[PDB]
Amino acid sequence: AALDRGNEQLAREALGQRQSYQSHTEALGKSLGEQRALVEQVRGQLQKL
Amino acid sequence: ILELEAERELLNPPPSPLDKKFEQWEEQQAVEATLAAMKARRS
Secondary structure (H helix, E strand, O other): OHHHHOOHHHHHHHHHHHHHHHHHHHHHHHHHHHHHHHHHHHHHHHHHO | OHHHHHHHHHHOOOOOHHHHHHHHHHHHHHHHHHHHHHHHHHO
16 A cells, blocks of 8 residues: 555565565464474374373 | 663564654545545535
8 A cells, every 4th residue: 555655665665574574474384384293193192092 | 760661662662663654654645535535525
């Protein structure tokens, strides 16, 4: 919505701002991809014991 | 007093001046558009 004015500099500022949040989102998405795969195996071990 | 004022500011960071400029611009756009519609509707 901010690009409507026609000043692309503020658009560049916002786009450069969101990149840190994108990087953080990817960083957490990487960690979840392995924690989810590990908790299942722990649950299986408990079930057999 | 200043120590406590800064210490509570550290825990919850204040918003960036860029955010304040953006929200001020949004408010100005909203009020300008609304007053334009105000002038156009009675006409």
